[PDB]
Amino acid sequence: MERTFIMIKPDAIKRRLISRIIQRFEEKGLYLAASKCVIPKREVLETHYSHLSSMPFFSEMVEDMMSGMVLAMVWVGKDAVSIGRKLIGETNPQAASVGTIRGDYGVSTGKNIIHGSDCVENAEKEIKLWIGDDVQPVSFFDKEWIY
Amino acid sequence: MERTFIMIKPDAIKRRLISRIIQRFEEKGLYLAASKCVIPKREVLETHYSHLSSMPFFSEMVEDMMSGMVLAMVWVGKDAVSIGRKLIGETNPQAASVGTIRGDYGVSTGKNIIHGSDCVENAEKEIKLWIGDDVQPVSFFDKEWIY
């Protein structure tokens, strides 16, 4: 099925939001397929956010993502990308709906808790960038109860 | 600080217990240092359970442990091995105290949710077997409030 790249940002790790974030994805029915703790490298962040290279404060946005360990994941399932974006909420947590990850826990645009892919093309690039080309297939153990 | 190896067994993944399990460790104050999604290989399992190789249930245990993805983790902190053991509870879920992972979620000894290292010696052996030689130092971000 479709897959998406979900990364818990360094400050959300430090706020101990890991279980609360994973609950949203796991209760929605998506399948965890990969997981990795990483201290992000500057070069990898610049590639991840290459579409942002022209924007004001690009350097600061990269620096913020370098301040500590992230939890990088792949979640799989029907409409995974759109589903993840909806669970996460608007870029700016003030605009995100209550009940979303950013709406419930987030305060600023720079520390907005989590990254999720915005489209299938970017998900594939991000997965290969952060995780690798050999993410192994997982069993859709309860597919019949969800679809 | 001390490290322990914590692995969510495949049936617990299928029961969607990931967030509830991580919650116990995260709220207790231990630090996540490594995370990997793995479909276990036979030779790995045969090494890990080498002390059980004469038992009549051995092949079944290996098959069950190969029946899906496991989530393998390292958690770090003062007394992390003993702390993880207590959070998890006794091997037989019917002997485990209510409030433990096994006591709250587990019914049978075979499908007892999770594995955690029994001592520091085994934790080190287990991390090297399942994760690798190079787990990076973790930032103890809220150490002064806990330890």
Side-chain angles (χ1 to χ4, degrees), chain A residues 19-20 25 47 70 88-89 118 147:
Chain A
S19 67
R20 276 167 286 183
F25 288 81
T47 307
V70 295
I88 286 164
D118 67 355
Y147 314 122

Side-chain angles (χ1 to χ4, degrees), chain B residues 12-40 42-60:
Chain B
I13 302 295
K14 300 180 178 179
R15 292 170 71 187
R16 295 192 177 262
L17 290 167
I18 298 174
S19 70
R20 278 167 288 182
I21 284 156
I22 285 175
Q23 181 184 345
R24 313 295 184 96
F25 288 85
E26 185 174 40
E27 286 185 341
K28 184 69 173 178
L30 300 176
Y31 298 101
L32 183 68
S35 198
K36 189 159 99 160
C37 292
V38 339
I39 296 159
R42 185 172 317 285
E43 61 276 7
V44 180
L45 286 168
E46 287 180 335
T47 299
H48 182 86
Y49 289 125
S50 59
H51 61 286
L52 306 174
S53 61
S54 299
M55 299 292 96
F57 60 75
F58 184 67
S59 294
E60 195 62 48

Side-chain angles (χ1 to χ4, degrees), chain A residues 13-14 16-19 22-23 26 29-37 39 69 71 137 141-142 146, chain B residues 13-14 16-19 22-23 26 29-37 39 69 71 136 138 141-142 146:
Chain A
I13 300 300
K14 301 179 172 177
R16 290 185 181 269
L17 290 169
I18 300 169
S19 67
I22 290 179
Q23 183 185 335
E26 181 174 42
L30 290 170
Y31 298 101
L32 182 65
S35 205
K36 184 182 180 214
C37 295
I39 312 87
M69 198 189 86
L71 183 62
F141 48 80
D142 59 1
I146 299 177
Chain B
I13 302 295
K14 300 180 178 179
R16 295 192 177 262
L17 290 167
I18 298 174
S19 70
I22 285 175
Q23 181 184 345
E26 185 174 40
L30 300 176
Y31 298 101
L32 183 68
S35 198
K36 189 159 99 160
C37 292
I39 296 159
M69 182 265 281
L71 182 60
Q136 299 300 288
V138 75
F141 49 82
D142 57 3
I146 294 169

Side-chain angles (χ1 to χ4, degrees), chain A residues 1-133 135-142 144-147:
Chain A
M1 283 178 293
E2 182 171 296
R3 34 190 223 165
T4 191
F5 180 70
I6 306 297
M7 178 175 55
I8 305 183
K9 298 196 169 166
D11 296 307
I13 300 300
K14 301 179 172 177
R15 297 176 61 189
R16 290 185 181 269
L17 290 169
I18 300 169
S19 67
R20 276 167 286 183
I21 285 161
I22 290 179
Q23 183 185 335
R24 313 293 185 93
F25 288 81
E26 181 174 42
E27 286 182 335
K28 185 57 161 179
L30 290 170
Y31 298 101
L32 182 65
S35 205
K36 184 182 180 214
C37 295
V38 207
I39 312 87
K41 289 300 218 149
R42 174 184 294 283
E43 323 84 76
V44 61
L45 287 169
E46 294 175 351
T47 307
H48 182 98
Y49 291 112
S50 57
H51 59 287
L52 309 183
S53 50
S54 292
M55 285 183 180
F57 306 99
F58 176 65
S59 182
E60 287 78 356
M61 303 195 272
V62 170
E63 229 77 286
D64 285 342
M65 282 294 291
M66 262 156 74
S67 69
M69 198 189 86
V70 295
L71 183 62
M73 292 165 285
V74 183
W75 286 85
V76 175
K78 282 175 187 178
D79 309 290
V81 173
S82 189
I83 284 171
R85 286 169 62 73
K86 181 147 197 188
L87 294 176
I88 286 164
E90 254 78 21
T91 297
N92 187 341
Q94 324 172 262
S97 314
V98 298
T100 63
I101 290 166
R102 291 170 174 161
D104 290 342
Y105 311 128
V107 174
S108 67
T109 64
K111 291 155 197 240
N112 64 354
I113 310 302
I114 190 175
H115 163 84
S117 308
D118 67 355
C119 63
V120 157
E121 169 167 282
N122 288 345
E124 291 305 302
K125 166 192 149 154
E126 292 161 10
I127 291 162
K128 299 175 217 149
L129 186 59
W130 293 93
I131 306 291
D133 358 295
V135 172
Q136 290 297 301
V138 292
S139 164
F140 312 132
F141 48 80
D142 59 1
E144 307 307 294
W145 300 339
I146 299 177
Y147 314 122

